[PDB]
């Protein structure tokens, strides 16, 4: 029904997975025969349960998906996206330290999508505030992404377009 955003942006830590990739785990990671992803020490790395379906829904809706993360553990963040087979859903990934305003300026530049036509999900208040000043519809999340968080965010975006 209501207008869809032209770009859906997600942070990684506490958005797609319940931890800080630069703090709680020890890269590199690998896939184990028991169906899990493990870090160098043997910890069981998991995504928030509905993350695969969240990205799959955006894919079905034709909504371009991008990442905007401020972690220093860049290699590890990308490896996780690949091992969980989530990388295929992303058209662009901005993963590096610094003000997230820089990540969004590059997303804006390469996609051509105006800031007002973007929706962003992050748990970090600092980022919600910084990016919000750009006109992006920012969705402050808790307990990571879920289909409810996604669908409510899309409604919020639609409302903002009005």
Could you say which of 13, 39, 122, 130 is catalytic?
Answer: 13
For domain 1-162, give the CATH superfamily.
HAD superfamily/HAD-like (3.40.50.1000)
Resolution (A): 1.9
Q: Which two tokens stand for residue 36?
A: 């899990």
Domain ranges of the chain: 1-162
Whether 11 is catalytic = yes
Going from the C-alpha of 61 to that of each of 7, 87, 101, 126, 148, the distances in angstroms are 11, 17, 26, 29, 16
Resolved by: X-ray
Please give the annotated binding residues for phosphate, written as ranges. Answer: 12-13, 69-70, 100
Whether 143 is catalytic = no
Please give the annotated binding residues, written as ranges. Answer: 11-13, 20, 69-70, 100, 123
């Amino acid at each position: 029904m209501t207008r869809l955003p032209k770009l859906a942006v997600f942070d990684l830590d506490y958005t797609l997975w319940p931890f800080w990739v630069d703090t709680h785990v020890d890269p590199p990671f690998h896939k184990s025969s028991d169906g899990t992803v493990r870090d160098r020490r043997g910890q069981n790395i998991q995504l928030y349960p509905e993350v695969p379906e969240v990205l799959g829904r955006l894919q079905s809706l034709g909504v371009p998906v991008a990442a905007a993360s401020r972690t220093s553990e860049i290699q590890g963040a990308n490896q996780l996206l690949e091992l969980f087979d989530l990388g295929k859903y992303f058209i662009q990934r901005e993963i590096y330290p610094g003000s997230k305003v820089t990540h969004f300026e590059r997303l804006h530049h390469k996609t051509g999508v105006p800031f007002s036509q973007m929706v962003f999900f992050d748990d970090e208040n600092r980022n919600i505030i910084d990016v919000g000043r750009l006109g992006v519809t920012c969705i402050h999340i808790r307990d990571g992404m879920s289909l409810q968080t996604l669908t409510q965010g899309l409604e919020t975006f639609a409302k903002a377009q009005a």
